[PDB]
């Protein structure tokens, strides 16, 4: 709502407060000079002021080269305010969340990753790799008998365009 | 006589709730360990930027104040009398006595013209500022 | 064209301030990007010196595995390194021990582990299975069997 | 007691008894564990330029369109930083392709390892040392990291498990099991000390190792400044953000710091001017904040590159670079996670009691 | 910052207060650099006890 409590104005969501004000204090202010609570001028109820939810809207999708289906993530927005999955990163709409873990494909934040699978976009908690217990003991040893040479490519930038602006 | 104010004289700058925060503010305050005058009588004293008043009475002898400029009916003045069960704050063109006092009887002023305001509602410390 | 000097001066001052601020931002962005490029160039120069002109013992500096050599290739605005590394492939469980007891003397491998075929102890290099007969010419003696 | 002033000493003098014919060799040796703390990442703050400058006001939002891409470029720069923070985290911790685990039977010779290994008693599945490291530390949003503390911890558990059960073999390829005493023997051989020294004193070395690990825990608990680098990074971002909010409440020459008051009190022909002054001030402030962040980010990236190199050379192998992996002759190191960073426990060989023996070239 | 911008002038010194912490942040940044220079010197030379 757009509120005005006596002389305190602004826009926000008001909820019941669990704070205890002194008999003469009319409003609360945080460490950044932002009003975060008011006393109701009529009924002496203390109300907390929460800024109205907002956030970036990002589209998570495999490229249009494969499918034109997309999923949309609303960052830091609860799903009651907007396949609907509420995650730690926000409200994710259009992805089917699954239990099977995989290597992370496209990052959505908070460990949750999405992938295009056989087809739809899914959300899952990412796996960090296959588990491999080592057969540790105090008396046994393993040595490669058929070694392989590996050639890998490492690419580094060295220079950039010498732009000169008068 | 004079004494050491130590760490007394702090007041809440405004009507704002703050929790576990260090707040820096500039206002008229009594300096720490400042020099405050100790009176035992009741002469007329100057009022500068504001006044800090304190008393340690068990018999409630001091129970009122006069504030103003002329204090002789020429200008409006504020008279406070915390009497019995009713404290009266009144602003009028009081013609004050040259030695005003209350009895145990009221002889504070002889006249009260152009009245503009009336409102009724150990160690005691007060801060008075306009 | 549209404004006389007494007004044009003001509109020009506004354009000059805006364009100067924009140019300041562009130069600041470039100086930062340049610093990142220089850090990258310093890494590339160190990488060539240690990976191309020699053999590196810094793990994962010249690629994954045990570095053997590398070959530089040029690229637009940069350098590409082909890293040639030795990688263990097929390990086996052989029979072993931390030391051998002979005449009460403790024989420690000069190099490698006390590998074997499950029955007769041998000795072999740490990074490649090639069992050798345990002899006095590939071991040394220190201490005794009770330590 | 009083405050004194003096010319500082640079350390005690120690003349070396140099001569052409005499040599001193440590009869005994001490394993040293030191703690090196490096920042890896910083808070992924994202500030919406338009929403910050023009707080839900149509007139300001429209006036802001005359500044072109300034807001777009600022949002892009902050996005780039936010992405870089996850790149840095992955580069530092995600260097292992498999999740290794220690055996149910911890027979590591009294080399405890309890303080560095995760336990099943805490719900966070972190080590006692990790427990100490964690417990002792307007139009803008904060984005969560891709790797949560639990996920980062799983990575350190895996790296620690590999270092303990397979030495350096898992870093260069497949994890090859080896008894821990031989792993220590190889690491001793790697610094010029024959393996019989380790085997003859193995019991002494293991008991001795526990006191060193317990001391690490006590040192970190006792000294509040031990993690100053990570708290300093946190403090720098908190100050940067608190600076922006205070700047928003400044006037910058305007008749009033509140945009709604400007719109209410002044007609458009005057409000436009006061708004332009507020827009210029707030845009300059946001430019300064982004510039400060880009610089801080570059320092963090340099630190992350050092931390990634340090783990690769100190954790996945054995270093021969003097003082790279702590003071002394490096034997091994163990990573521990920390808020926004990584803590390395460096295990080094240090000569202790030298003697003069007779010698010749 | 203040002394540089407002050379001992009351009117400027008061007008400069409308810019908030800009001078504070600049003084802080320069202090941080000054401290870093001593940290760098100690790191390079003070490696022996
Ligand atoms: C990209 O496009 C090409 C042709 O347009 C297609 O063959 C290829 O599969 C595409 N890649 C993906 C991931 O869709
Ligand atoms: C969404 O709203 C419900 C109802 O108030 C609340 O309980 C829940 O915690 C909210 N989710 C988030 C992420 O705030
Ligand atoms: C994962 O499995 C648990 C039970 O094994 C189930 O309760 C949960 O809903 C599953 N998650 C998904 C996304 O299906
Ligand atoms: C080693 O690998 C090569 C190439 O794959 C193969 O030709 C050869 O048979 C292998 N030798 C052994 C001993 O496994
Ligand atoms: C005290 O005296 C004042 C004198 O004007 C009078 O107005 C007030 O009522 C008195 N107090 C009480 C309790 O009557
Ligand atoms: C009576 O008081 C009012 C104050 O509101 C003042 O303006 C007026 O002049 C006073 N009377 C005389 C005669 O001054
Ligand atoms: C290595 O030893 C473990 C147990 O000691 C065994 O399970 C595993 O199969 C062995 N590997 C080979 C190749 O023999
Ligand atoms: C082990 O290797 C040796 C040499 O190849 C061979 O003589 C022996 O038969 C093998 N197995 C046993 C029984 O030790
Ligand atoms: C070496 O130091 C340890 C720990 O102080 C001690 O227990 C041991 O007796 C010492 N040995 C020698 C050779 O002095
Ligand atoms: C590990 O540390 C615990 C802590 O009390 C101690 O009780 C135990 O004996 C230690 N054991 C090993 C194997 O380190
Ligand atoms: C080492 O030699 C110097 C002189 O050659 C002698 O003063 C010193 O005491 C010696 N140290 C020991 C432990 O013998």
Swiss-Prot record, chain A:
Modification after translation (UniProt): The cytoplasmic Cys-rich domain is palmitoylated. Palmitoylated spike proteins drive the formation of localized ordered cholesterol and sphingo-lipid-rich lipid nanodomains in the early Golgi, where viral budding occurs.
Outcome following mutation: residue 9 to K: In strain: Omicron/BA.1
Subcellular location: Virion membrane; Host endoplasmic reticulum-Golgi intermediate compartment membrane; Host cell membrane
SS bonds (residue pairs): 79-91, 104-113
Glycosylation sites noted in the Swiss-Prot or TrEMBL record: 65, 78, 99, 118, 138, 146
Domain notes: Contains sequence and structural motifs very similar to those of a bacterial superantigen and can directly bind and activate T-cell receptors. Activation of a broad T-cell repertoire may be involved in the hyperinflammatory syndrome in acute COVID disease.
Outcome following mutation: residue 32 to D: In strain: Alpha/B.1.1.7
Lineage of the species this protein comes from: Viruses, Riboviria, Orthornavirae, Pisuviricota, Pisoniviricetes
Annotated consequence of substituting residue 97 to Y: In strain: Gamma/P.1, 19B/501T, 19B/501Y, Omicron/BA.1, Omicron/BA.2, Omicron/BA.2.12.1, Omicron/BA.2.75, Omicron/BA.4, Omicron/BA.5, Omicron/BQ.1.1, Omicron/XBB.1.5, Omicron/EG.5.1
Residues of the full protein shown: 539 to 737 of 1273
Other known facts: Variant D614G has become the most prevalent circulating sequence in the global pandemic since April 2020. The mutation is associated with higher viral loads produced in cell culture and animal models. It would not change pathogenicity nor neutralization properties vs vaccination. May be prevalent because the mutation increases virus transmission in human population.
Protein name: Spike glycoprotein
Applications (biotechnology): Main component of the anti-COVID vaccine Chadox1/AZD1222/AstraZeneca; in which the human tPA leader sequence is added in N-terminus to enhance protein secretion.
Effect of residue 75 to H: In strain: A23.1
Outcome following mutation: residue 115 to A: No effect on O-glycosylation by host GALNT1
């Amino acid at each position: 709502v757009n509120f005005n409590f006596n002389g305190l104005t602004g826009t926000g969501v008001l909820t019941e407060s669990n704070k205890k004000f002194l008999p003469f204090q009319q409003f609360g202010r945080d460490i950044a000079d932002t009003t975060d609570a008011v006393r109701d001028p009529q009924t002496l109820e203390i109300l907390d002021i929460t800024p109205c939810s907002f956030g970036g809207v990002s589209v998570i999708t495999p490229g249009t080269n494969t499918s034109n289906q997309v999923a949309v993530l609303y960052q830091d927005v609860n799903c009651t305010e907007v396949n609907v999955f509420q995650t730690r990163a926000g409200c994710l709409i259009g992805a089917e969340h699954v239990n099977n873990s995989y290597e992370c494909d496209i990052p959505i934040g908070a460990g949750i990753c999405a992938s295009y699978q056989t087809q739809s976009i899914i959300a899952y908690t990412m796996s960090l790799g296959a588990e491999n217990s080592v057969a540790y003991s105090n008396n046994s040893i393993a040595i490669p008998t058929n070694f392989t040479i590996s050639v890998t490519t490492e690419i580094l930038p060295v220079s950039m365009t010498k732009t000169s602006v008068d | 006589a004079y004494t050491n104010s130590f760490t007394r004289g702090v007041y809440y700058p405004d009507k704002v709730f703050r929790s576990s925060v260090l707040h820096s503010t500039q206002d008229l305050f009594l300096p720490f360990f400042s020099n405050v005058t100790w009176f035992h009588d009741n002469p007329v004293l100057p009022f500068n930027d504001g006044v800090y008043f304190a008393s340690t009475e068990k018999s409630n002898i001091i129970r009122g104040w006069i504030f103003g400029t002329t204090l002789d009916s020429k200008t409006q003045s504020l008279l406070i009398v915390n009497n019995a069960t009713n404290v009266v704050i009144k602003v009028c063109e009081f013609q004050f006595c040259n030695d005003p006092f209350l009895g145990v009887e009221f002889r504070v002023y002889s006249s009260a013209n152009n009245c503009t305001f009336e409102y009724v509602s150990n160690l005691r410390e007060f801060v008075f500022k306009n | 064209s549209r404004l006389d000097p007494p007004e044009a001066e003001v509109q020009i001052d506004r354009l000059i301030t805006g364009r100067l601020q924009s140019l300041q931002t562009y130069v600041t962005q470039q100086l930062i990007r340049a610093a990142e490029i220089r850090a990258s160039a310093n890494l590339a120069a160190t990488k060539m010196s240690e990976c191309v002109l020699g053999q590196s013992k810094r793990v994962d500096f010249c690629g994954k595995g045990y570095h053997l050599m590398s070959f530089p290739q040029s690229a637009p605005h940069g350098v590409v390194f082909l890293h040639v590394t030795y990688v263990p492939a097929q390990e086996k469980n052989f029979t072993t021990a931390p030391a051998i007891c002979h005449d009460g003397k403790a024989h420690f491998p000069r190099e490698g582990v006390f590998v074997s075929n499950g029955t007769h102890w041998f000795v072999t290099q740490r990074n490649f299975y090639e069992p050798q007969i345990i002899t006095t010419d590939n071991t040394f003696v220190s201490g005794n069997c009770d330590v | 007691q009083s405050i004194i002033a003096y010319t500082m000493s640079l350390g005690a003098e120690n003349s070396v008894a140099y001569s052409n014919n005499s040599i001193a060799i440590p009869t005994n040796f001490t394993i040293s564990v030191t703690t090196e703390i490096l920042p890896v990442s910083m808070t992924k703050t994202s500030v919406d330029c338009t929403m910050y400058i023009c707080g839900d006001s149509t007139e300001c939002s429209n006036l802001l369109l005359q500044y072109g891409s300034f807001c777009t470029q600022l949002n892009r720069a902050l996005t780039g930083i936010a992405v870089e923070q996850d790149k840095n985290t992955q580069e530092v911790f995600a260097q292992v392709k498999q999740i290794y685990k220690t055996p149910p039977i911890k027979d590591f010779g009294g080399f405890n390892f309890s303080q560095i290994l995760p336990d099943p008693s805490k719900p966070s599945k972190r080590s006692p040392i990790e427990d100490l490291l964690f417990n002792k530390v307007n139009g803008l949003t904060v984005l969560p990291p891709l790797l949560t503390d639990e996920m980062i911890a799983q990575y350190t558990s895996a790296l620690l498990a590999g270092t303990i059960t397979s030495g350096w073999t898992f870093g260069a390829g497949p994890a090859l099991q080896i008894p821990f005493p031989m792993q220590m023997a190889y690491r001793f051989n790697g610094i010029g000390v024959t393996q019989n020294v380790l085997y003859e004193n193995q019991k002494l070395i293991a008991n001795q190792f526990n006191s060193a690990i317990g001391k690490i825990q006590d040192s970190l608990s006792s000294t509040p400044s031990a993690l100053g680098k990570l708290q300093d990074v946190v403090n720098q971002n908190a100050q940067a953000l608190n600076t922006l909010v205070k700047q928003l409440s400044s006037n910058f020459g305007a008749i009033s710091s509140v945009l709604n008051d400007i719109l209410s009190r002044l007609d458009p022909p005057e409000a436009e001017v006061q708004i332009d002054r507020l827009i210029t001030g707030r845009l300059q402030s946001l430019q300064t904040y982004v510039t400060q962040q880009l610089i801080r980010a570059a320092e963090i990236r340099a630190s992350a590159n050092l931390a990634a190199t340090k783990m690769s050379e100190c954790v996945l192998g054995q270093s021969k670079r003097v003082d790279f992996c702590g003071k002394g002759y490096h034997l091994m190191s163990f990573p521990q996670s920390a808020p926004h960073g990584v803590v390395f426990l460096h295990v080094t060989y240090v000569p202790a009691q030298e003697k003069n023996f007779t010698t010749a070239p």
